Design a protein around this ligand. Structure first.
Ligand SMILES: CCN(CC)S(=O)(=O)c1ccc(O)c(NC(=O)c2[nH]c(C)c(C(C)=O)c2C)c1
Length: 124
């Protein structure tokens, strides 16, 4: 069945507000969230509902934009690179589990390109 979703808070970790973190939420995440192809990435893969019994056998480091959004809202991330890493993991999982030309792969590609375009303008 499904694992618990990734942690979206850490009570043991100090919190900070930064221009980069705020940009990641309000510009980067927000723009990807609203793309027509965002929906498969807005929540963890529900392998039970979707009947994908091997998904969590193959994908041991799941990640999704719903988790990333909550992490940003919760100040889970101290370093902006942590957030960027989570995006990378999310896209990479898609390329691990699926095949060239699958709908989901084409959707990930479009989102990843948009991600690159938005991160390009990450503030210093
Ligand atoms: C419409 C309502 N849903 C979304 C809110 S849904 O019912 O959960 C729903 C219905 C049908 C679906 O095909 C999905 N698919 C996915 O989400 C999804 N995402 C990723 C990253 C993958 C893989 C395998 O990489 C898959 C299969 C989700």
């Amino acid at each position: 069945m499904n694992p618990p979703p990734p942690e979206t808070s850490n009570p043991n970790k100090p919190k900070r507000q930064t221009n980069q973190l705020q940009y990641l939420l309000r510009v980067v995440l927000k723009t990807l969230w609203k793309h027509q192809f965002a929906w498969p990435f807005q929540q963890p893969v529900d392998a039970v509902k979707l009947n994908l019994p091997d998904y969590y056998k193959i994908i041991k480091t799941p990640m999704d934009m719903g988790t990333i959004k909550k992490r940003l809202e919760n100040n889970y991330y101290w370093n902006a690179q942590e957030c960027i890493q989570d995006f990378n993991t999310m896209f990479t999982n898609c390329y691990i589990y699926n095949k060239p030309g699958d709908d989901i792969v084409l959707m990930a590609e479009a989102l990843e390109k948009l991600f690159l375009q938005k991160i390009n303008e990450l503030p210093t």
